[PDB]
Write a protein that binds this ligand. Structure first.
Ligand SMILES: CCOCCn1c(C(F)(F)F)nc2ccc(C(=O)c3c(C)nn(C)c3O)c(C)c2c1=O
Ligand SMILES: CCOCCn1c(C(F)(F)F)nc2ccc(C(=O)c3c(C)nn(C)c3O)c(C)c2c1=O
Ligand SMILES: [Co+2]
Ligand SMILES: [Co+2]
Lengths: 381, 381
């Protein structure tokens, strides 16, 4: 059931912003590793004396990488005279974030009809304000509320190219990389206590629980058309193998964003391209499931995927799970930086055609059991 | 003249350590951009709860990338019980360094006969101590003194593979990249006042002035065999075009390391390989000199380089200068990170055969005049 109870009009995921120590090096690594193009910049060469911000795009996916300059460059500025292109930015908040959590997501940004009203309504409904609505060049409005930990939910609305004050990047520095990634499917938070986190976020958004069907409990919040998907996890304590949610909270110094799931229009090509680059500057992937997992795929999805397509999943280490509505292919990277905290998921969904409805196939929860049974069977051989 | 006045026995440049916010992303970017292999690590997977350190190598060149974990992981430790593989490391010093300077070089490390005696003698001769000698696993001794700004000169000595506590990296994560870079030729500091910087460093090392022959004055300190080369620059103020040394000091918040010159055994291949990767995660280069600069090369070095070799320099944007002893080919990257501070030089030297003596060809100082005259001539066409 979908009660469609959004308290404001929400469109789609707009962008994800990483707070970094050096935005240049993170952005160049991610660009090569994920096949994203340099699309826009706001830095010293555009008159920004406050922060360096570089935007990568692939299809509709937008990754923003921001780091602070020396405060000395902007010491004479005040907020009314700021050269920052993102007015919510603050040197002290950014350094403290990165000092505390390491490299990670500061902002999950969604495009809304009216960022000011979304902010007003959210705060009227319990959201903790982080940055009030600010209108950029009479053209774009941006506002922020606390989501969990030090992550903000950022609202953006356009009267009618990323943000005012950003410049298009020179063609020569913009190499048209593309490994098939097209959009953000969902963004996942880790918290110590799922209940209060859910109540808070669903409280101020009107997002509803999205129906599902070790080491965690989780629930997914969704917008009216279920294209904005915000799962949240808590750990399950005192188990056998220590909870990876608990490991996250320890190394991250508390709650924060756990993984970003990026939809590919051709997950075979995406993973071929990402895996060729894993050891030359790109991203590493979790160890592949054993061959027993792929033998078991015939009985589970043999009607969806041919044997050759299954052998292709085996080559690339792809996981497969299935709903009552659709089928999903997925794989997880190793952590994106030094700490065992944030990682990336690549996802492609089969089914639920009407366009494709969101969450088609679910989120792969059945793969914990399947991989475990596969592990037992592989030891048996 | 070389008075050979080293106060302790110095061998060669050993490694350069970058202090980072996330060592993983900087190291992966540099590896792809410069063609350096992942050689060793010290991190959570090796039992280091304090810092993440990753070593890249190409030939004899060693780049170390280090970042701090959350202090909470090592809160129960004391220095006698530390899990840090580099005992001079300190969370607060590293965060403060990076907060203040951004991404840059913390340590210029030279291999000496006896790091304890080198430290003792240096401090007896005016060096400011930074970290005292510590013997690692009865095998390697490391000590540090202040060089300029927040950069240290690190002494390392071996009784008889990088440092104890580091592990060799798994073959699969170690892709054998190689674009021809072989060793560190020299490492250059920027300071507000050259005189006191020179007197201090030459004071405690015994390094002598290495004979030479806009915006800067400079001088080069050298070890006995002139294989360790430490140039230092100060700005020249009130000019026409603002001094790039002054621009460095402003954006770096004071003195620090300006550039690293990396010797290539085949600068044509190095630059071909680096330029292919500039816009896909690698490094950018300074804008090429105009064709007039390359026409003028025939009269300057036509006896050293064939016309085809000169046309190859033109293709790759390589600069050429010449001594009374030898010829050097050089090129400069754009800044390595967000700030207009540290950059890299690629260098190859022709001549001074006996092995090749250090500094053969000088450091390219004649290229300021040559490029300026070349600019005037190119506008004329
Ligand atoms: C990264 C290192 O972990 C590898 C272990 N692992 C395994 C494995 F391989 F063990 F089966 N299966 C998974 C299946 C789904 C999801 C996931 O995306 C999800 C979940 C669950 N709920 N919601 C709302 C989601 O979006 C995730 C993270 C995993 C996962 O992490
Ligand atoms: C990076 C942006 O600057 C580009 C402008 N530029 C030019 C240009 F192109 F203008 F001619 N020529 C140079 C020649 C030599 C050196 C250099 O390595 C050196 C110097 C001088 N003294 N010592 C001890 C050295 O090692 C350097 C930096 C440059 C340089 O920076
Ligand atoms: Co997921
Ligand atoms: Co140089």
């Amino acid at each position: 059931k979908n009660p469609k109870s959004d308290k404001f009009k929400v469109k789609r995921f707009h962008h994800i912003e990483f707070w970094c120590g050096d935005a240049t090096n993170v952005a160049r690594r991610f660009s090569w590793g994920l096949g994203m193009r340099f699309s826009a910049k706001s830095d010293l060469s555009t008159g920004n004396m406050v922060h360096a911000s570089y935007l990568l795009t692939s299809g509709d996916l937008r990754f923003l990488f921001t780091a602070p300059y020396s405060p000395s460059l902007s010491a004479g500025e005040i907020k009314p005279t700021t050269t920052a292109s993102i007015p919510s930015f603050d040197h002290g908040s950014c350094r403290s974030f990165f000092s505390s959590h390491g490299l990670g997501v500061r902002a999950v940004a969604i495009e809304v009809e009216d960022a000011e009203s979304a902010f007003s309504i959210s705060v009227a409904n319990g959201a903790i304000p982080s940055s009030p609505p600010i209108v950029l060049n009479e053209a774009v409005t941006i506002a922020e509320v606390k989501l969990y930990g030090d992550v903000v939910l950022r609202y953006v609305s356009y009267k009618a190219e990323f943000l005012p004050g950003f410049e298009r990047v020179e063609d020569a520095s913009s190499f048209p990389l593309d490994y098939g990634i097209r959009r953000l499917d969902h963004a996942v938070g880790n918290v110590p206590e799922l209940g209060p986190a859910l109540t808070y976020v669903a409280g101020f958004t009107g997002f509803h629980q999205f129906a599902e069907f070790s080491g965690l409990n989780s629930a997914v919040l969704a917008s009216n058309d279920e294209m904005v998907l915000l799962p949240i996890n808590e750990p399950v304590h005192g188990t056998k193998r220590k909870s990876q949610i608990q490991t996250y909270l320890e190394h991250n110094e508390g709650a924060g964003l756990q993984h970003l799931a990026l939809m590919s229009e051709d997950i075979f090509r995406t993973l071929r391209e990402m895996r060729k680059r894993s050891s030359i500057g790109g991203f590493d992937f979790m160890p592949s499931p054993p061959p027993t997992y792929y033998q078991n795929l015939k009985k589970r999805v043999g009607d969806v995927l041919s044997d050759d397509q299954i052998k292709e999943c085996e080559e690339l280490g792809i996981l497969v799970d299935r709903d009552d509505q659709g089928t999903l292919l997925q794989i997880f990277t190793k952590p994106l930086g030094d700490r065992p905290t944030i990682f990336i998921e690549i996802i492609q969904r089969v089914g639920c055609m009407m366009y494709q409805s969101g969450g088609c196939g679910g989120f792969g929860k059945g793969n914990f059991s399947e991989l475990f049974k596969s592990i037992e069977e592989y030891e048996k051989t």
